[PDB]
Amino acid sequence: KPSACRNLFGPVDHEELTRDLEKHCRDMEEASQRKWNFDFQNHKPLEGKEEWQEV
Amino acid sequence: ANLLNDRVLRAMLKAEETCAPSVSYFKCVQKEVLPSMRKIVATWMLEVCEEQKCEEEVFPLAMNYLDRFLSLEPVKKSRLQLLGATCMFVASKMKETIPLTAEKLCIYTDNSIRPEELLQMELLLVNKLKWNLAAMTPHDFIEHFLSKMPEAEENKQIIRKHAQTFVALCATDVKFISNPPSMVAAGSVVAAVQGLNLRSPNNFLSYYRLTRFLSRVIKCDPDCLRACQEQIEALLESSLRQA
Amino acid sequence: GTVYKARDGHFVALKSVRVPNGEEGLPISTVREVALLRRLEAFEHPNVVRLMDVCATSREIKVTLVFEHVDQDLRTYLDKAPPPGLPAETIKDLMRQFLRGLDFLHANCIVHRDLKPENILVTSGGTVKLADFGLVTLWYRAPEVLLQSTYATPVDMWSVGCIFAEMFRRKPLFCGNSEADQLGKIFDLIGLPPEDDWPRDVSLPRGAFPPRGPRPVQSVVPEMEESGAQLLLEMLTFNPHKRISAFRALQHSYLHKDE
């Protein structure tokens, strides 16, 4: 493997990493669902500031 | 004419003010990482972009993504390399025809990160930046400056290449996070015109007229541009010392 | 997906796009077009639809674009016009906003490629807002598009002229069957162009059309003034490299607001 192939700052706890990225991919997605009254994966309106329609 | 007013250049200086990282994310946001660790990872990404013969904008654009994510989220020491590999993964998609594969970037980490971990970090990085990936690069301002300089195309290619080297060295240094891409590009051009002190510059447009022209289009005092040029040439001296 | 809509105290539209995903994360076309749409909102142009947010949600990924919505398009505005038609000063005000927003896109290397009154959207306050860019009616396509030749940003300036004449007419300028018929419907007015103004690597040779002569312009839009007629010709020029630009049209005296 080439010279640039190197680990910089030790090993990675992979189980804790995918655990951390699932909590924060959910965090921003939940805050976006709480910002627009719209769960985007469920693709359904919720209740709050906006009155959601359909043309 | 628009060449007399330059509506394009003013639009570029307005767009540079949005994709801007913070000056003090080391003191205020980051707990585990220190400016010595940013230089380490930045040095690694530059070697990756040089081995893979990436487009000239990929490494500085990735450093722009990295400094902007570190201005928003505290990143662990063990995940700084993952953030760096992800910033190159997105920048390569924005600037290259056939971008770097996720599997090659994991190899460049000595297989420290996994492909899906990079793909999941891609969604996190792009959402955290709110898809503001079309940042203004110093290369954008370099091409605009060279289009206003009455120099031979052969002389422009040396200036363009020398400035691109200066731009890359600025991205590895912490002292240039506060500088906008216009300032980095302008200082890289006037430093490159001096020709690495290998030759007394013979340019059709004098250096005095060049620096004062560049200072009035990027809106700064000429002494401020000279101090940026001095910091860049000081970076060149320190970079060559590491051998 | 299915389009949604909400009001506060304004209006907001929805847009869901499912992208392939798997190979190497997000597609190249997805990250670049959405980032360019994000880049335009840094300037906050009043004549371009405002993109509010971008939300990606992960197997499967679906990124949903949240745009600003208006109800009235241009054709509804034109159908709602007074029976005599729109006043001249009102048309010049809409043409200014049209060219302002178009020059904004052209300055950011964006060609609309598909400009029609169903795409130009007008607010209740009279503000024109372009939409549907960076993501059959042949009547607004430029001749370089109908010939399937090399097309650039001047293809939008041809569409501007067709709509410029349509606001004074409330009837489209050229209505044709196919691309061959539409180009024939274009040569009613500007005549048949000469030899070297015609490009090659086209779909239709020049000999496919009878020798024609340019007709007077106020035969198709008489309710316009003479200075507006020469501005229409500069937009409705065959050669895309002589066609007037959006910025140059704003400097024309016809669209100069008096006082």
Cβ atoms C147, C199 nearer than 8 A: yes
A-chain residues near C62 (CB < 8 A):
40-41
**Would you say how long chain C is, in residues?**
259
Looking at the structure, tell me whether residues B27 and B129 fall in a common domain.
yes
Q: Name, in order, each residue with C-beta under 8 angstroms of C243's C-beta and a sequence gap of 6 or more.
A: C154, C157, C158, C234, C235, C237
Distance, CA of B6 to CA of B221 (rounded, Å)? 20
B-chain residues near A16 (CB < 8 A):
none
B-chain residues near C62 (CB < 8 A):
none
Looking at the structure, tell me whether residues B55 and B96 fall in a common domain.
yes
Distance, CA of B45 to CA of B81 (rounded, Å)? 9
Domain count, chain B: 2
Across the A/C interface, how many CB contacts are shorter than 8 Å? Answer: 43
Cα-based angle B138, B141, B142 (whole degrees, multiple of 5) = 85
Determine if residue C228 is labeled as part of a ligand binding site.
no
- Whether C58 has its CB under 8 Å from any CB of chain A: the answer is yes
Selecting among C114, C132, C181, C188, the annotated active-site residue is C114
Distance, CA of B229 to CA of B191 (rounded, Å)? 6
Question: CA nearest B136: which of C148, C81, C36?
Answer: C36
* Minimal-distance CA residue of chain A relative to B41: A8
B-chain residues near C38 (CB < 8 A):
130-134
Q: Name, in order, each residue with C-beta under 8 angstroms of B34's C-beta and a sequence gap of 6 or more.
A: B26
C118: closest CA of chain B, how far (Å): 28
Distance, CA of C155 to CA of C145 (rounded, Å)? 7
Distance, CA of B166 to CA of B162 (rounded, Å)? 6
Helix axes C28-40, B80-95, angle to 10 degrees: 90
Cβ atoms A9, B80 nearer than 8 A: yes
DSSP tag of A40: T
Query: Is the CATH number 3.20.20.70 carried by domain C1-71?
Result: no
> What is the residue whose two structure tokens read 């500069």?
C234
B-chain residues near C36 (CB < 8 A):
134
C-chain residues near B101 (CB < 8 A):
24
Q: What is the CA radius of gyration of chain C?
A: 20
Q: Name, in order, each residue with C-beta under 8 angstroms of C129's C-beta and a sequence gap of 6 or more.
A: C46, C47, C48, C49, C68, C70, C101, C120, C121, C122, C123
State the virtual CA torsion across C215, C220, C222, C223 in degrees, nearest 10.
Answer: -160
- The widest CA-to-CA distance across chain C, in whole angstroms, is 62
Tokens of B35: 């400016």
Tokens of A47: 């209740």
Tokens of B232: 């860049």
Contact C4 A35 (CB under 8 A): no
Contact C38 B133 (CB under 8 A): yes
Q: Name, in order, each residue with C-beta under 8 angstroms of C213's C-beta and a sequence gap of 6 or more.
A: C191, C192
Distance, CA of C242 to CA of C239 (rounded, Å)? 6
Tokens of A25: 């991919």
Indicate the residue of A25, A29, A54 with minimum beta-carbon distance to C2.
A54
Looking at the structure, tell me whether residues B63 and B46 fall in a common domain.
yes
C-alpha B123 chain-centroid distance:
23
Domain end, chosen from B118, B134, B150, is at B134
Tokens of B223: 């002494």
Contact A40 C2 (CB under 8 A): no
Q: Name, in order, each residue with C-beta under 8 angstroms of B241's C-beta and a sequence gap of 6 or more.
A: none
- Whether B13 has its CB under 8 Å from any CB of chain C: the answer is no
- CA distances (Å), origin C174, targets B199, C164, C183, C216: 64, 12, 9, 15
C234: closest CA of chain A, how far (Å): 39
Distance, CA of C43 to CA of B100 (rounded, Å)? 31
Tokens of A55: 């043309």
- Whether B80 has its CB under 8 Å from any CB of chain A: the answer is yes
- CA distances (Å), origin C37, targets B122, C33, C59, C67: 19, 6, 26, 11
Indicate the residue of A9, A11, A17 with minimum beta-carbon distance to B80.
A9
Distance, CA of C7 to CA of C217 (rounded, Å)? 44
Question: CA nearest C69: which of C135, C1, C6?
Answer: C6
Structural domain for B83, as ranges: 22-134
Distance, CA of C230 to CA of C211 (rounded, Å)? 23
- Whether B24 has its CB under 8 Å from any CB of chain A: the answer is no
Distance, CA of C238 to CA of C174 (rounded, Å)? 14
Cβ atoms C143, C191 nearer than 8 A: no
Cβ atoms C232, C164 nearer than 8 A: yes
Cα-based angle B21, B221, B185 (whole degrees, multiple of 5) = 45
Of chain A, the end-to-end C-alpha distance in Å amounts to: 57
Q: Which of C15, C23, C24 to mutate to test the interface with B (most CBs of B within 10 A)?
A: C24
A55: closest CA of chain C, how far (Å): 7
Looking at the structure, tell me whether residues B118 and B140 fall in a common domain.
no
Distance, CA of C185 to CA of C183 (rounded, Å)? 5
Looking at the structure, tell me whether residues B128 and B28 fall in a common domain.
yes
Looking at the structure, tell me whether residues B85 and B97 fall in a common domain.
yes
**HSE (CB half, 13 Å, CA atoms) of B211?**
17
Domain count, chain A: 1
> What is the residue whose two structure tokens read 């020049």?
C206
Distance, CA of C127 to CA of C46 (rounded, Å)? 8
Distance, CA of A31 to CA of A37 (rounded, Å)? 10
Cβ atoms C127, C48 nearer than 8 A: no
- Whether C42 has its CB under 8 Å from any CB of chain B: the answer is yes
- Whether B102 has its CB under 8 Å from any CB of chain C: the answer is yes
Tokens of C93: 């005000």
Distance, CA of B165 to CA of B144 (rounded, Å)? 17
Kind of pairing between the strands at C121-122 and C128-129: antiparallel
Cβ atoms B90, B125 nearer than 8 A: yes
Determine if residue C213 is labeled as part of a ligand binding site.
no
State the virtual CA torsion across C219, C220, C224, C229 in degrees, nearest 10.
Answer: -80
Sign of dihedral through CA atoms C20, C25, C26, C28?
negative
> What is the residue whose two structure tokens read 């024939």?
C184
Active site residue C114: yes
**Top-tier CATH class for C72-254:** mainly alpha
Determine if residue C5 is labeled as part of a ligand binding site.
no
Structural domain for A31, as ranges: 1-55
- Whether B146 has its CB under 8 Å from any CB of chain C: the answer is no
B-chain residues near C247 (CB < 8 A):
2
* Minimal-distance CA residue of chain C relative to A39: C57
Contact C6 A32 (CB under 8 A): no
Question: CA nearest B169: which of B16, B59, B32, B70?
Answer: B59
Distance, CA of C142 to CA of C133 (rounded, Å)? 17
Tokens of B160: 């363009």
Under the phi-then-psi rule, with left for phi > 0, alpha for psi from -120 to 50, and beta for the rest, what region is B137? beta
Tokens of B227: 């101090």
Taking residue C180's Cβ as centre, other Cβ atoms within 10 Å add up to 15
Indicate the residue of C26, C54, C247 with minimum beta-carbon distance to B130.
C54
Q: What is the CA radius of gyration of chain B?
A: 18
Cβ atoms B41, B81 nearer than 8 A: yes
The 3-state secondary structure of chain C, one letter per residue: CCCCEEECCCEEECCEEEECCCCCCCCHHHHHHHHHHHHHCCCCCCCECCEEEEEEECCCEEEEEEEECCCCEHHHHHHCCCCCCCCHHHHHHHHHHHHHHHHHHHHCCCCCCCCCCCCCEECCCCCEEECCCCCCCCCCCCHHHHCCCCCCCHHHHHHHHHHHHHHHHCCCCCCCCCHHHHHHHHCCCCCCCCCCCCCCCCCCCHHHCCCCCCCCHHHCCCCCCHHHHHHHHHHCCCCCCCCCCHHHHHCCHHHCCCC
Distance, CA of A2 to CA of B137 (rounded, Å)? 29
Helix axes B222-241, B181-193, angle to 10 degrees: 70
Determine if residue C220 is labeled as part of a ligand binding site.
no
**HSE (CB half, 13 Å, CA atoms) of B169?**
23
Considering chain C, tell me which residue range(s) the CATH 1.10.510.10 domain(s) occupy.
72-254
Tokens of C25: 């994360």
Q: What is the CATH number of the domain that holds B208?
A: 1.10.472.10
Distance, CA of C112 to CA of C119 (rounded, Å)? 10
- H or E element, residue B126: helix B115-128
Question: CA nearest B193: which of B234, B241, B142, B231?
Answer: B142
Contact B41 A18 (CB under 8 A): no
Across the B/C interface, how many CB contacts are shorter than 8 Å? Answer: 64
- Whether C136 has its CB under 8 Å from any CB of chain B: the answer is no
- Whether A46 has its CB under 8 Å from any CB of chain B: the answer is no
Structure determination method: X-ray
State the virtual CA torsion across C246, C251, C253, C255 in degrees, nearest 10.
Answer: 50
Looking at the structure, tell me whether residues B8 and B105 fall in a common domain.
no
